Write a protein that binds this ligand. Structure first.
Ligand SMILES: CCCCCCCCCCCCCCCCCC(=O)OC[C@H](COP(=O)(O)OCCN)OC(=O)CCCCCCCCCCCCCCCCC
Ligand SMILES: Nc1ncnc2c1ncn2[C@@H]1O[C@H](COP(=O)(O)OP(=O)(O)OP(=O)(O)O)[C@@H](O)[C@H]1O
Lengths: 459, 344, 140, 52, 64, 102, 46, 319, 98, 38, 49, 51, 119, 63
């Protein structure tokens, strides 16, 4: 694993000392080399999981996130290469360093076994994000947004830690697969119930429900492309991975400790998908769509069925990539205009003839057009939920419909009307942003082709 | 203050605690306490301005009552047994009085409403000592007598300090008073852990010191004792920020830094000893300290406030005050979490 | 002799409302006296008249809070016969916070107090049941 | 104690009269000399909770 | 710009809580969740008692 | 007397890059740097990563044994079909070595 | 070229050589002590 | 160096405070014979003369000593003030504050020179003398009471900690003669000042500066021709005494603390760069950042003095 | 012995009240401090001479000297206060609350 | 457009000796900058 | 969902801070408070033995 | 010259080398159970030195 | 805590008893990290005094690094000693009092009943 | 290399971690017993010494 980390810990001094004319290219290409080397984990010949020490490990549920992160790093770099163009070399170097620290932390956590290490990394993820969001935004409320982000996250963090302590004491160790081979069952009293809470509350507060979805839009809006990318892609996924790895112990509590959370997740999926219709701000629309899909993820995580877990992982990866892509497109249309509003720029596709086909290929992946990992996940999760009850296809379908609606609303208020006549600032497409779109897409094709990699624990 | 006087006073200040600790007699302890008190008052009152004099009066009065109370305790112990030292056979009221006095002498709450006023009246190079070389002997006294204490009131006092310090820090702008409230809270953490494992109070104290001293160095730099006077650091000297931000987040106790480790292993001990409720309160109310550190991070680094023209006349100049130990302690605070086991 | 505060758990939640209510009202008066003493020693006012008026405001307020809370929890325990379950104490704390809000003339404070105090009481009951000790003694 | 500088140097400055039955100047023994000499001898070799 | 401001951020400041508003809010936040919940709980209890009896034809439900 | 505005530079203007470097690519205003960085991106991320990564993966063997297992099932089914045993017993562990209460 | 070339205008050979010498002596004492401890440890535990 | 150590070692101040180790001002109005007079005085009394601190004292002392660009230096313009006052920009106050600060730097370096070597100094208009201009501005209406209060606060903060000047000469020339000298010199900006301006200057001087300071420093009011005859001034000052002031309420150790404070070239200005927000001087982060970047891009200011390589330093990898 | 000792402890408590409650002066507080110190010195010497212990007698001397010096610096501070305000009152110290 | 940075109306809610003067009792005056009162 | 969780916490902590820093610098009051605390501690020990 | 510029490209390869070496050292540790397991317990055929 | 154990030689950094313990191979990651800390501290001091970083104060950096290591070495020895002592005392007390630790030999999953918890 | 490598590595790791868990779950108990009954070297609180006492005649037989 050091083979993945150490070079990512060398990109930093590399950035510091390299000359301005060359740091961008050098660090970018070498981060791509890191992404490449990050595939050794896929030599999972047999079912014996990979273990490198008492301090690291890998797994089928973690490897995807690792590669996706090591591959979203350079895309953040590139998408962060036209703005802050008049900001000093030292400042842009700081930005690069923060991105790289995010990468390294995310890798170490998605790999680590001991949930306490996982937790310290899960909470160290903040500093770079808070910074990136406050020191490089474009509005004023970014401050309140960062505050909300930080404090939601830490409120979650605390009882999680307290329960990790209670465990480490009652049980002997915290190492995973030992928690498995020596788990037990609980008398199911108010004590163990509040323990279940203090263990899942943080992961949920992070992966937003209806009740606490508030810090997502502010972040994705006030913050720049890279922060938006990384939020929509991974910093949510951390909660899901933690919940998956930890729920192994709390059996059986999660049968009746789920109804409220499943209910909230579904209702929130619906209401947020509806708001996605009448939400002006494009990035806010995208954020609420992300909420709508992560609600499915959660409803599939709780009930603990194998189909459900595989669908969760599929939809997870798919949404990560697709949201990064949509945010790239938004930023693109913003740098030329400097207004997030959806109804200002209209009737494109007459001057950006190609870009549309990078807009289209995203929506179709949002509304679950097959053959896509998106629909595979949505469908397996709907199957699990139908088994768990026959009266949830209702909500699945309402969500599918409202999505099929607002995805096209977005396509049609930006690439289907008639062109304005005062947007003389429409610098044509840059090879760079076209490349970012292509790189976010192509992997969707290859994974639609061969998804056995992207299944999960149960496959 | 001529050099002979300066040297003698610094010597007595460096002595008081040394005796208070190395002595096994409570009278010698009380003596060292009085040494610190006396030898310090001047350093507070040197400027001879009204505010300094007022702060001196407050400080002296409170610490006098405290010392006399501790003396009453010792004498009652004498009448009771005969020895000048505390044993495991002393009526708990005496311990409770000793604890009230030590608290009032430290700054714990609700005996704390005199620390912010004084620390606002004082300059920096004496508030630093007031917070980092006067809270040692009073803590050594406890280190000696931790077994037979009253956990109930110790915990009530600690958590009360947590709450009140945080709630006051949410408002106070004056950085001196902010630092004072932070001291209150951290000493609350210590007293909370104390009767279970003292080494952890030692650790919390050393860490709070290593985080405070360099902040006060960065302040002594400019005599910027206000938020709108420190926000101008990015135009006076844009270098201290990459370390001030870290140190304040640390004082808050963010995991990847070191300021977290104390709270972490402390909660561990309290969970071993079944105090998880108060542990939860402490952990869920340190977040306000974290808050009003973040709110200064904002003002200084993450966003640039309006400067003042004459700062150009300043920048034309130079400055070589900031010695090496500042950076040394900053680093050995922020980037030393991997070495917690080697710290225990 | 501390019996006036220990008797609260001689019987379970159930009858003896005339006792549980006196006890909760006593706690109300105590907390009121204490908070009033602090807010009189500090943040003083003009006349002893207004000072003791503030004191009595606080004291009667807390007394009524404790009375209403303990009474609700002795009544629910009687009717909804699932005594040990803490929803009794939660509803009682909600009614108490609502009384506090009706006194202070603030619906927001009413609801805030409902939530916070009710959950606090439910946790007190959870502790009394599962032996969670407060102000412990050191045995690592 | 806390900082055993005294025991390290093998000296004594205060701890030679920390209690009652120490060496009084002109051999004038105190009131409860014997009872102290027994309490201490029972509380030696062991620590604290044993003696209490 | 002003339209966006009024739809996005000028809301809470000029917002004043009153009844029928608190009422509609509590409704939208409580009612439907609880309806769906009673539905699901009744269904699950039906299924559970059916299985405990040992009747519900589960043939071919090998993957779930 | 009425009021004054805090001295501040004016709002910069909206410009064009293609007016001075119609060979643009999006990265920098230095053409050589643009060219070399875009060639780096493409090569290191279209020629090597995508291609060699896809190749590696596609030629990975028996990912999580979904091939060895098919083989093993074929062999076991042959064995049992011949020997008359059933293809799947409703009890996994030997109920003999096991022991139960009353 | 300045007008008031201050203290930093030229090096302090005293402190330079002092630091280098103390560093070298730290290194050498470290190595000697480590080798001594290795010898003695192997001696006392085979 | 002058830490406490050199003092303990012997490099004190009283051991070189000899005769004529004094400090003087030669104040008056705009075009009196100030510079010729002060230079005559300096030559006759072996002191050193410090010219009138303007808008470039800092840039000329620090670095390679060349008049820097206005963006880095204050952003004021005396010519633009004389041409267009009352504008919506703020030149009046963002010039007066800058000039006060530079004058303060002057006085500080002067006390340093003195307390290090008793060789006395002569000063033109000083920090005590740089408030009549502001009072004239306000009385004419060029400026806001808020800015006046800001200035008075800065003064209350800095002015005290330093020691007033032993001797103070005041040259009294009225508006008509001052205007004659103006027109003789010739300048399209000086040519446009107002007799009321100069009259307010004179009034403020002769009302505040003289009584205030006759109680804690020696004064000498002279006229045009008595100045044109300098030597008389020299002999007056020589045979004059220097009672009634703080400068003898001091000793080695207060002199030492004062010298340390002065030598500290930012303990003088941590109370002049204070955060009180006025749209006159108040500058935004964008401008401040741009200017700091350009300055640190300049040669000789990128790094500290003894480290900039390009300029032609060496041994830059040991110190 | 026990009676007089309890009474001396009562006197200490009374000086405690005198110091912890003011009547718009400062010399009263300092005099109550002196009363505390006197009661303590007395109780200690009594304990010693009752136990017939001798080596423990230096302690009253020590603490009496320290109380002398303490009250001395307190009086110096009182004096600076009076000479910088105009009197030794207590309600003049409304500063530092900002 | 460009990064919005703070300004006077944002910084002059801190100049007050204490944040959050939600009460009338927060009617005090800022403290001097040299620790001297008139 | 904003008036409930975050703005409620804000108002609450804000008011508690207003209280705990509405204090004026009067020893005549600080000492009375110290005395109340001493009384409390003594009484608690007495009850709990 | 040019190495001051074109040397930086040596770090990352060196980092990868160091990483593989550290993993090799870790795997050389934990050498216990080299062949003592109960599902890959061989006879150590001649001339076939240990894993 | 343990400062009263049998014959706790007071204020002695490393007793002779701490020569029968394997010292740390100088390649140890902890010492290496302290070296990095010294280097970064020199960097920070230079950037604070406004000096060329990575090419100034070489003697300063050497001093920092070597001091940090020269300390870490012996501090780490002391800590290894403390942990060894803790473990030794624990095992000794266990060997003294076995009854306080009944060697409960668990039962097989055959004899023990794992209760069920479906889905 | 082969799967057996990772297999046996996993096995050694599990052994280590289980032994660690055992040690900690025993250390808690040991420390508890020591603190509660002082039967051990740890938590040996400080007692009055016995070397600064006199065993010489004291000018009067009694005492
Ligand atoms: C973790 C992923 C999420 C992260 C996204 C970022 C990705 C960057 C990392 C590198 C790119 C991802 C690697 C994708 C591997 C592509 C696998 C592949 O090429 O498909 C294999 C396919 C053979 O089919 P297969 O599924 O293996 O077996 C079934 C029997 N036909 O053979 C084919 O037909 C392939 C068709 C190629 C045209
Ligand atoms: N505080 C001030 N504010 C604005 N302008 C000033 C200020 N002080 C001086 N000036 C301008 O600077 C110029 C100084 O020239 P001045 O006549 O004083 O020369 P001098 O030093 O008297 O020598 P001489 O007059 O013999 O040439 C004046 O024309 C005056 O307008």
């Amino acid at each position: 694993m050091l083979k993945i980390i150490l070079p990512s810990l060398m990109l930093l001094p590399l950035t510091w000392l390299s000359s301005p004319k060359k740091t961008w290219t050098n660090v970018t290409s070498y981060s791509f080399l890191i992404s490449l080397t990050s595939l050794t984990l896929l030599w999972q010949t047999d079912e014996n999981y990979k273990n490198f020490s008492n301090m690291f490990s890998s797994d089928p549920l973690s490897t995807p996130l690792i590669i996706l992160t090591a591959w979203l790093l350079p895309l953040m770099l590139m998408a962060s290469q036209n703005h802050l163009k008049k900001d000093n070399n030292v400042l842009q170097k700081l930005y690069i360093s923060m991105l790289i620290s995010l990468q390294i932390l995310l890798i170490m956590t998605f790999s680590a076994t001991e949930l306490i290490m996982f937790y310290i990394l899960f909470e160290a993820t903040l500093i770079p994000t808070l910074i990136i969001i406050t020191r490089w935004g474009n509005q004023t409320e970014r401050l309140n947004a960062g505050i909300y982000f930080l404090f939601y996250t830490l409120i979650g963090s605390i009882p999680l830690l307290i329960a990790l302590i209670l465990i480490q004491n009652h049980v002997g160790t915290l190492n995973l697969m030992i928690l498995s081979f020596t788990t037990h069952t609980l008398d199911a009293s108010w004590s163990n119930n509040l323990l279940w809470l203090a263990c899942m509350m943080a992961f949920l507060i992070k992966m937003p429900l209806y009740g606490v979805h508030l810090w997502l839009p502010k972040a994705h809006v006030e913050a720049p492309i890279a922060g938006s990318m990384i939020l929509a892609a991974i910093l949510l996924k951390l909660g899901s991975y933690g919940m998956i790895r930890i729920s192994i112990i709390l059996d059986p509590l999660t049968k009746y400790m789920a109804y409220p959370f499943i209910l909230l997740s579904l209702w929130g999926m619906i209401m947020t998908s509806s708001i996605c219709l009448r939400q002006t701000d494009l990035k806010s629309l995208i954020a609420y769509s992300s909420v709508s899909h992560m609600a499915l993820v959660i409803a599939s995580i709780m009930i603990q069925t194998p189909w459900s877990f595989m669908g969760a992982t599929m939809l997870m990866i798919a949404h990560g990539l697709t949201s990064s892509l949509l945010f790239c497109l938004a930023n693109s249309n913003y740098e030329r205009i400097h207004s997030r509003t959806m109804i200002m720029a209209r009737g494109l596709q007459m001057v950006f003839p190609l870009m549309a086909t990078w807009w289209l290929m995203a929506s179709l992946a949002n509304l679950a057009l097959p053959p896509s990992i998106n629909l595979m996940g949505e469908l397996f999760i709907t199957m699990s939920l139908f088994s768990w009850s026959n009266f949830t296809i209702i909500l699945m379908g309402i969500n599918i419909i409202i999505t099929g609606m607002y995805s096209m609303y977005m396509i049609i208020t930006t690439q289907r009307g008639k062109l304005t006549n005062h947007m003389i600032n429409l610098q044509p497409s840059h090879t760079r942003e076209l490349t970012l779109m292509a790189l976010h897409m192509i992997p969707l094709i290859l994974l639609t082709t061969s998804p056995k990699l992207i299944t999960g624990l149960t496959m | 203050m001529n050099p002979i006087t300066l040297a003698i006073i610094y010597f007595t200040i460096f002595l008081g605690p040394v005796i208070t600790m190395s002595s096994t007699n409570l009278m010698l302890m009380w003596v060292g306490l009085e040494f610190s008190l006396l030898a310090i008052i001047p350093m507070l009152i040197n400027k001879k301005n009204p505010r300094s004099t007022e702060a001196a009066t407050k400080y002296f009065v409170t610490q006098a009552t405290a010392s006399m109370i501790i003396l009453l305790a010792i004498v009652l112990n004498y009448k009771q047994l005969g020895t000048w030292m505390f044993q495991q056979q002393t009526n708990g009221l005496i311990l409770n009085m000793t604890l009230m006095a030590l608290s009032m002498k430290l700054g714990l709450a609700p005996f704390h409403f005199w620390l912010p006023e004084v620390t606002q009246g004082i300059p920096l190079h004496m508030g630093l000592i007031l917070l980092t070389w006067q809270k040692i002997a009073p803590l050594s006294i406890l280190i000696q007598i931790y077994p037979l204490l009253n956990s109930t009131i110790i915990l009530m006092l600690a958590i009360t300090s947590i709450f009140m310090g945080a709630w006051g820090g949410l408002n106070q702008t004056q950085m001196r008073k902010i630092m004072a409230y932070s001291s209150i809270a951290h000493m609350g953490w210590m007293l909370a852990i104390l009767p279970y494992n003292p080494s952890l109070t030692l650790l919390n104290l050393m860490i709070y010191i290593i985080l405070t001293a360099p902040m006060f160095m960065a302040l002594m730099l400019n005599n910027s004792m206000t938020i709108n006077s420190i926000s101008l650091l990015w135009n006076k000297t844009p270098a201290m920020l990459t370390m001030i931000s870290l140190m304040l987040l640390s004082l808050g106790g963010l995991p990847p830094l070191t300021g977290f480790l104390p709270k972490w292993i402390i909660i561990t001990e309290l969970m071993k000893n079944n105090c998880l409720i108060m542990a939860t309160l402490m952990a869920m109310m340190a977040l306000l300290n974290l808050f009003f550190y973040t709110r200064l991070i904002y003002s200084t680094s993450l966003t640039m406030f309006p400067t003042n023209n004459n700062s150009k006349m300043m920048t034309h100049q130079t400055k070589t005050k900031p010695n090496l130990m500042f950076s040394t302690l900053a680093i050995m605070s922020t980037m030393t979490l991997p070495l917690a086991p080697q710290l225990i | 002799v501390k019996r006036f505060f220990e008797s609260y758990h001689e019987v379970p939640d159930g009858t003896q409302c005339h006792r549980k209510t006196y006890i909760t009202t006593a706690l109300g008066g105590i907390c009121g006296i204490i908070g009033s003493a602090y807010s009189v020693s500090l943040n003083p006012a003009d006349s002893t008249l207004e000072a003791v008026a503030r004191v009595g405001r606080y004291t009667f307020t807390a007394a009524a809070i404790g009375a209403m809370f303990g009474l609700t929890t002795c009544v629910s325990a009687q009717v909804r016969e699932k005594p040990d379950d803490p929803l009794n104490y939660f509803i009682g704390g909600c009614a108490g916070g609502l009384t506090l809000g009706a006194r202070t003339h603030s619906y927001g404070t009413a609801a805030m107090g409902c939530v916070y105090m009710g959950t606090a009481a439910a946790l007190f009951k959870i502790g009394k049941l599962e032996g969670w000790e407060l102000f412990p003694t050191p045995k690592v | 104690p806390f900082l055993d500088i005294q025991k390290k140097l093998g000296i004594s400055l205060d701890r030679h009269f920390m209690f009652l039955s120490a060496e009084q100047p002109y051999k004038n023994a105190a009131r409860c000399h014997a009872f102290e000499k027994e309490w201490i001898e029972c509380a030696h070799g062991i620590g604290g909770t044993r003696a209490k | 710009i002003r339209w966006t401001y009024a739809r996005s951020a000028n809301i809470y400041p000029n917002f004043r809580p009153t009844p029928k508003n608190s009422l509609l809010g509590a409704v939208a936040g409580f009612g439907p969740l609880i309806f769906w919940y009673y539905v699901f709980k009744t269904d699950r209890d039906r299924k559970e008692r059916l299985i405990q009896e040992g009747k519900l034809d589960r043939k071919f439900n090998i993957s779930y | 007397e009425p009021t004054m505005q805090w001295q501040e530079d004016p709002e910069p203007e909206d410009e064009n890059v293609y007016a001075k470097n119609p060979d643009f690519h999006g990265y920098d205003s230095d053409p050589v740097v643009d060219v070399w960085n875009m060639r780096a991106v493409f090569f290191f991320g279209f020629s090597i990563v995508l291609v060699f990564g896809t190749t590696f993966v596609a030629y990975v063997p028996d990912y999580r044994m979904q091939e060895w297992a098919r083989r093993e099932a074929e062999r076991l089914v042959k064995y049992r079909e011949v020997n008359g045993l059933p293809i799947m017993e409703s009890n996994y562990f030997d109920p003999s070595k096991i022991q139960l209460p009353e | 070229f300045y007008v008031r070339e201050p203290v930093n205008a030229k090096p302090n050979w005293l402190a330079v050589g002092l630091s280098v010498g103390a560093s070298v002596f730290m290194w050498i004492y470290l190595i000697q002590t480590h080798n001594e401890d290795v010898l003695e440890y192997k001696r006392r535990n085979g | 160096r002058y830490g406490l150590l050199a003092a303990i070692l012997g490099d004190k101040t009283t051991k070189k405070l000899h005769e004529y180790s004094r400090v003087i001002t030669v104040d008056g109005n705009i075009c009196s014979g100030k510079n010729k007079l002060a230079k005559e005085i300096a030559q006759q009394l072996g002191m050193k003369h410090y010219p009138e601190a303007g808008i470039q004292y800092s840039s000329t002392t620090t670095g390679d000593g060349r008049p820097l660009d206005i963006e880095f230096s204050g952003s004021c313009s005396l010519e633009k003030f004389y041409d267009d006052p009352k504008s919506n920009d703020g030149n009046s106050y963002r010039l007066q504050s800058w000039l006060y600060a530079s004058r303060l730097l002057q006085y500080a370096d002067a006390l340093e020179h003195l307390l290090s070597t008793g060789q006395g100094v002569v000063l033109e208009r000083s920090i005590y003398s740089d408030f009549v201009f502001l009072e004239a501005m306000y009385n004419q209406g060029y400026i806001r009471k808020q800015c006046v209060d800001h200035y008075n606060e800065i003064k209350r903060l800095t002015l005290p900690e330093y020691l007033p000047p032993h001797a103070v000469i005041y040259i009294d020339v009225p508006v008509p003669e001052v205007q004659s000298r103006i027109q003789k010199k010739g300048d399209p900006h000086e040519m446009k000042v107002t007799s009321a301006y100069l009259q307010d200057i004179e009034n403020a001087y002769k009302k505040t500066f003289l009584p205030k300071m006759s109680e804690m420093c020696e004064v000498l009011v002279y006229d045009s021709w008595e100045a044109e005859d300098p030597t008389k001034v020299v002999e007056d000052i020589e045979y004059l005494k220097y009672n009634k002031g703080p400068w003898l309420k001091q000793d080695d150790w207060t002199f030492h603390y004062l010298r340390m404070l002065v030598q500290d070239k930012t303990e003088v200005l941590n109370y002049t760069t204070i955060p009180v927000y006025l749209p006159e001087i108040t500058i935004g982060a964008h401008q401040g950042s741009r200017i700091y970047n350009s300055f640190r891009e300049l040669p000789g200011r990128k790094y500290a003095p003894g480290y900039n390589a390009e300029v032609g330093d060496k041994w830059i990898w040991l110190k | 012995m026990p009676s007089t000792f309890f009474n001396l402890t009562m006197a200490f408590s009374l000086s405690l009240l005198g110091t912890l409650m003011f009547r718009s002066h400062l010399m009263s507080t300092l005099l109550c401090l002196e009363g505390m110190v006197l009661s303590l010195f007395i109780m200690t010497s009594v304990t010693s001479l009752n136990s017939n212990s001798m080596s423990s007698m230096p302690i009253p001397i020590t603490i009496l000297v320290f109380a002398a010096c303490e009250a001395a610096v307190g009086l110096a501070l009182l004096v600076k206060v009076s000479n910088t305000y105009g009197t030794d009152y207590v309600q003049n110290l409304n500063l530092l609350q900002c | 457009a460009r990064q919005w940075q703070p300004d006077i109306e944002w910084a002059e809610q801190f100049s007050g000796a204490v944040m959050y003067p939600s009460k009338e009792t927060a009617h005090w005056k800022p403290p001097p900058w040299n620790d001297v009162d008139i | 969902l904003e008036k409930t969780i975050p703005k409620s916490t804000s108002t609450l902590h804000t008011n508690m801070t207003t209280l705990t820093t509405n204090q004026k610098g009067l020893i005549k009051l600080y000492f009375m408070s110290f005395l109340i605390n001493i009384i409390l501690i003594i009484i608690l020990y007495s009850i709990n033995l | 010259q040019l190495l001051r510029e074109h040397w930086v490209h040596i770090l990352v390869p060196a980092g990868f080398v160091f990483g593989c070496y550290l993993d090799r050292k870790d795997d050389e540790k934990l050498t216990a159970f080299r062949n003592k397991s109960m599902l890959f317990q061989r006879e150590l055929r001649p001339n076939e030195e240990v894993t | 805590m343990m400062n009263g154990r049998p014959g706790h030689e007071p204020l002695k950094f490393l007793p002779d008893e701490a020569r029968s313990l394997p010292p740390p191979k100088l390649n140890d990651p902890r010492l290496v990290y302290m070296g990095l800390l010294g280097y970064c501290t020199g960097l920070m001091d230079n950037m604070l005094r406004m000096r060329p970083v990575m090419r100034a104060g070489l003697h300063r950096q050497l001093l920092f690094v070597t001091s940090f290591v020269f300390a870490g070495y012996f501090y780490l020895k002391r800590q290894n000693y403390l942990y060894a002592v803790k473990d030794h005392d624990m095992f000794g007390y266990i060997k003294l009092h076995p009854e306080d630790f009944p060697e409960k030999e668990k039962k097989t999953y055959a004899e023990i009943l794992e209760p069920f918890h479906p889905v | 290399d082969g799967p057996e490598k990772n297999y046996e590595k996993t096995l050694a790791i599990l052994q280590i971690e289980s032994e660690k868990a055992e040690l900690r779950l025993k250390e808690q108990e040991v420390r508890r017993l020591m603190r509660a009954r002082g039967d051990g070297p740890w938590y040996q609180f400080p007692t009055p010494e016995k070397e600064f006492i006199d065993h010489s005649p004291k000018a009067t037989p009694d005492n």
